[PDB]
Structure 1
Amino acid sequence: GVGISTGTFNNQTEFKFLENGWVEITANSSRLVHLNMPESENYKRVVVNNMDKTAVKGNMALDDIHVEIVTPWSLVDANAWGVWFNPGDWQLIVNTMSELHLVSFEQEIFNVVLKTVSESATQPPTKVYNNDLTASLMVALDSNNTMPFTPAAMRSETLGFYPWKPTIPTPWRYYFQWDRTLIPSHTGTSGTPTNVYHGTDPDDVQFYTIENSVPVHLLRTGDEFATGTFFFDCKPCRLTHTWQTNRALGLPPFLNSLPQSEGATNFGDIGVQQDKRRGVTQMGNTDYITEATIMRPAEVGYSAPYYSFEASTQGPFKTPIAAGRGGAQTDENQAADGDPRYAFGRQHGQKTTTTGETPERFTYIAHQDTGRYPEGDWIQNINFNLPVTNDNVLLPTDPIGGKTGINYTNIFNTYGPLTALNNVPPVYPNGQIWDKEFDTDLKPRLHINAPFVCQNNCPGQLFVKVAPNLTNQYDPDASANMSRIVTYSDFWWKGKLVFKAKLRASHTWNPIQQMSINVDNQFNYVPNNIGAMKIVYEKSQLAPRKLY
């Protein structure tokens, strides 16, 4: 069955409006995937050790040592917003929907092709491509999620974002266990710290093979493969942001004195002595009821140690932070509430005609005011007693450990039973969409990498690979490296991701932040005279929501 197609290209996003303001978004994405023969046919256990870098005192954070199993299989990952929606669709969703529901996912492989390269070793010399009709492409869909979960978006290795531009999958590899020690130090530290990779703990070894745990399918041109329809189990993702802070929760103080003339100088006045006011407070000493002192239900947001690194059996790792805005606009603390920074290129944004190999990037800065501005933090001695005396105040300025560039905010952590928090907002187009939950007894309240964490079950991973096209000479009983015909494959991938949205309703007199084409962004949405493209990142939760 060579002369018949086995599939259809479809990259349309359908918006189906239902009853009561609910829409059913059907994002169709098709892509032509190009796939090469594995450079090797065996699994390799490789160690990566860049001690040359960590050898330099004060370079701990640049540690890359790990051990990974290198498989002869490739992963077809489509878990990233850019694969399903273009700037247009996205603007539609973000400007009018109030919440998003991830419903189901299904993919299929069709119109498979396998060619053989022949070196017409004459003159230049030449190269001749031919069809190997009876050759097969191997396909394995790990439904049971036996294999380790490895999101390609984490390393900008998902399918590309352009319907009219071929793409490729990524060689699949996964972490193996290993013990590693690396002691912190600074430029002036003495002696040689302790930078040792101890190896692997036998009680943590887990060598996985696809061949042994997932049925594999062989497809020839005539064949096709389709996944079933997987249904997610995730909480809805909101498309609105909160702006309220503790300072803006509840009943404002009653102004006894109101401005009588226009002018951004004419303020209103509470009109009551800060120690002669009524209200509630959690400060049993003073009688000062102040906007920064009065009681509030709980606490929106929280403080966590910044540029903290922790260490365990495998080595050091940065301490993650779940947090939004908190601070002026061109007045951040990227570190404090962890604004994510995305590095990618060409195939996932970055102008296409770009040269060199320096990735493009951006630091996403959410609209939700749930972050913190450390410099504003301070601490006072129980006696209160203002103006506070230097001996009774710890400030983001006073040093810690005699260190000049470290202070309590750095060590600080105000997470507790009163912490109100929100989930990570979606990041177009470089963000991951869904993520598999940790199989720990107690799970995390959220994941920092994706807004959708399928709990009870997630779509399995799809592995692809060109099956061994051997030559007439092959001897198992001789390490050699099995000479095999240079074969490559081309197939089309088609996926269908279904969402369920809820149309928003206005509730204020005033208009609202809406995504829109300007005379400034204009050319970020259209190709140029050479056909170069790029996909600029966009914000998602533009639109306020009352928090309390």
Structure 2
Amino acid sequence: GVGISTGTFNNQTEFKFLENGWVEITANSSRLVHLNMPESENYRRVVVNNMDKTAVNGNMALDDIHAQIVTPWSLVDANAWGVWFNPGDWQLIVNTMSELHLVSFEQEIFNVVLKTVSETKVYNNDLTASLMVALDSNNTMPFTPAAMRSETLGFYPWKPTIPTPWRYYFQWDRTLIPSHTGTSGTPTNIYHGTDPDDVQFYTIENSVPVHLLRTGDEFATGTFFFDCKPCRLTHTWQTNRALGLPPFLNSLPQSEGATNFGDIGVQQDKRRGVTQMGNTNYITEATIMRPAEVGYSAPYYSFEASTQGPFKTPIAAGRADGNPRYAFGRQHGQKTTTTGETPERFTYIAHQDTGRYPEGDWIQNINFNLPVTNDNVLLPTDPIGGKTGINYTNIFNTYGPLTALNNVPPVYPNGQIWDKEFDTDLKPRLHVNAPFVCQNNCPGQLFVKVAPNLTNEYDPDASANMSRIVTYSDFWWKGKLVFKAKLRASHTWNPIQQMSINVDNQFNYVPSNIGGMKIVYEKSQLAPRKLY
């Protein structure tokens, strides 16, 4: 009936210790989700067009033009680490466990309450109204991970949260020919409408079943089961220079201090080993053959254009090029007592040395005369196309059959957990936004809406928008996300880097006088691992 609860709030996380060094980490997350009725019941098609800001030359990268289908429904997205683990739990994971698997995910909506507002304001319960709830178990709707906008559920168990108003991209065609400031004339900045071939208009009602929960009953998702490959919570330091057998040292130092270097015994042209430079006798640490290349130079801050306008070419590993910058609000880590629209921001400087240092690169001639003359070496000081600001490494790619790379580290609290794999015939090696990638199917997106609570005046033939009783709902959401992880072992003599509270970072992890809270970013790959 009305007065009987239908579920238990639970935000614990158990660590269940299995045989042979595995821990099943069960993350439970519970949230009171608050949902206003939509602005309009009708699906809208809206084009955004900042021609005004892109027509001023040089502002090519600020291109916000897109089309989207604004939708009445709202989405409950739990795909972020902060929804599940607190800083203590994340510490216990990263400091002690070497690899991490997803196992399962499930959701429950329970204890729905519906309320109506009447004008002072009086709030009255509507026992007859219903929360409309839909689960895309089949992944027929366009996937929309809310972490890329920081519109996931809130990361504090106590605060209530709100679901993201749903929307998805529509077709559009655009050309934006770039232009520096001081260009002679206006480039062709124009919007070409939409290709009829590419139209896809989706609706929740026609695509998936919908449940009219009312105040007294639950919605529950079956246990979805992942099959993803392990994310590894440990980072690799070995550049190409640090793979294989180091040279033998003949004059070892005989006293302490940095001044007392050791020296290889024999001249560089009389050394022995394998180089991959057929015409050159010099065997050096730069020239000696290595098994393969760790990381790759990629053309940095390259913007590339399709039918739908320009976009940045992503890069798999950063050195600050490549490293991700997260901007986030007060639900999701910023100090809740701060005023102002301005988001808090961090840049995740990962530990791993799979990146590149472009200012150190160079290319030189096949002849390889040793003290290379000016005409025979292209340096990062040298201009391509006469542009002093654009050296060759900006326009340069060395991906190849020998490139080795790591998956992106987890970013706590804002980074995605899982991502859907593309339906392309040829699929990318990695996704730069989440560690785990769903191979064949991914957890169904959960859509919520409050039903149209009509008034007596309604006439469908009237042109104006329908009159609705102003309704809102609160529903408790409970998630259970299960991981399986392997405890580390101390192979080295020396201890490893670890996350720790200290005098500097102390008060980031406890509330303030007026109860303000924050969640700082914590690095997810601390222990070093052996690449070779």
Matched, 1:162 2:146: no
TM superposition score normalised by structure 2: 0.99
RMSD: 0.7
* Distance in 2, Cα, partners of 1:374 & 1:467: 57
Shift of 1:188: 1.2
Which of 281, 292, 298 matches 1:287?
281
Cα deviation 1:73-112 (Å, max 9, x = unaligned): 0000010000000000000000000000011000000000
* Distance in 2, Cα, partners of 1:455 & 1:49: 36
* Distance in 2, Cα, partners of 1:312 & 1:520: 47
* Distance in 2, Cα, partners of 1:232 & 1:495: 15
Q: Is the 8 A contact 1:233 1:457 kept in 2?
A: no
Cα deviation 1:386-415 (Å, max 9, x = unaligned): 210010000001000000100110001000
* Distance in 2, Cα, partners of 1:184 & 1:274: 49
Shift of 1:455: 1.1
Matched, 1:222 2:216: yes
Give the equivalent residue in structure 1 for 2:241: 247
Structure 2 counterpart SS, 1:247:
helix
Q: How does 1:48-63 map to 2 (within 5 A)?
A: 48-63=48-63
Matched, 1:430 2:424: no
Cα deviation 1:453-477 (Å, max 9, x = unaligned): 0111111100000000001110011
Matched, 1:3 2:3: yes
Shift of 1:337: 4.8
Cα deviation 1:361-403 (Å, max 9, x = unaligned): 0110110100000010001101100210010000001000000
Cα deviation 1:130-156 (Å, max 9, x = unaligned): 000011000000000000000000000
* Distance in 2, Cα, partners of 1:243 & 1:540: 15
* Distance in 1, Cα, partners of 2:266 & 2:398: 32
Q: Is the 8 A contact 1:324 1:367 kept in 2?
A: no
Q: Is the 8 A contact 1:101 1:500 kept in 2?
A: yes
* Distance in 2, Cα, partners of 1:64 & 1:40: 24
Matched, 1:187 2:181: yes
Matched, 1:456 2:450: no
Q: Is the 8 A contact 1:322 1:337 kept in 2?
A: no
Cα deviation 1:147-170 (Å, max 9, x = unaligned): 000000000000000000000001
Structure 2 counterpart SS, 1:544:
strand
Q: Is the 8 A contact 1:302 1:371 kept in 2?
A: yes
Cα deviation 1:473-519 (Å, max 9, x = unaligned): 10011111111100100110000000000000001111110110001
Structure 1 counterpart SS, 2:105:
strand
Structure 1 counterpart SS, 2:237:
coil
Shift of 1:527: 0.2
Shift of 1:324: 4.2
* Distance in 1, Cα, partners of 2:503 & 2:65: 47
Shift of 1:448: 0.4
* Distance in 1, Cα, partners of 2:460 & 2:261: 88
* Distance in 1, Cα, partners of 2:66 & 2:160: 32
* Distance in 2, Cα, partners of 1:338 & 1:480: 49
Shift of 1:236: 0.4
Cα deviation 1:429-471 (Å, max 9, x = unaligned): 0101000001100000000000010111111100000000001
Structure 1 counterpart SS, 2:53:
helix
Q: How does 1:20-35 map to 2 (within 5 A)?
A: 20-35=20-35
* Distance in 1, Cα, partners of 2:499 & 2:109: 35
Q: Is the 8 A contact 1:57 1:189 kept in 2?
A: yes
Q: Is the 8 A contact 1:10 1:494 kept in 2?
A: yes
Q: Is the 8 A contact 1:337 1:371 kept in 2?
A: no
* Distance in 2, Cα, partners of 1:161 & 1:398: 48
* Distance in 2, Cα, partners of 1:486 & 1:223: 23
Cα deviation 1:234-277 (Å, max 9, x = unaligned): 10000000000000110000001110111111011101100001
* Distance in 1, Cα, partners of 2:474 & 2:244: 61
* Distance in 2, Cα, partners of 1:71 & 1:502: 43
Q: Identify unmatched segments of 5+ residues in structure 2.
A: none
* Distance in 2, Cα, partners of 1:110 & 1:161: 19
Shift of 1:17: 0.3
* Distance in 2, Cα, partners of 1:337 & 1:277: 38
Which of 448, 454, 457 matches 1:470?
454
Q: Identify unmatched segments of 5+ residues in structure 1.
A: 120-125, 326-335
Q: Is the 8 A contact 1:14 1:27 kept in 2?
A: yes
Which of 147, 153, 157 matches 1:153?
147
Give the equivalent residue in structure 1 for 2:110: 110
Shift of 1:190: 1.1
Q: Is the 8 A contact 1:337 1:372 kept in 2?
A: no
Shift of 1:7: 0.7
* Distance in 1, Cα, partners of 2:295 & 2:283: 23
Shift of 1:191: 1.1
* Distance in 2, Cα, partners of 1:512 & 1:310: 41
Matched, 1:275 2:275: no
* Distance in 2, Cα, partners of 1:262 & 1:480: 87
Shift of 1:14: 0.4
* Distance in 1, Cα, partners of 2:227 & 2:61: 37
* Distance in 2, Cα, partners of 1:308 & 1:232: 35
Structure 2 counterpart SS, 1:515:
coil
Shift of 1:116: 0.5
Structure 2 counterpart SS, 1:241:
strand
* Distance in 2, Cα, partners of 1:250 & 1:484: 72
* Distance in 2, Cα, partners of 1:430 & 1:221: 32
* Distance in 2, Cα, partners of 1:324 & 1:259: 36
Which of 172, 175, 181 matches 1:178?
172
Structure 1 counterpart SS, 2:183:
coil
* Distance in 2, Cα, partners of 1:54 & 1:70: 24
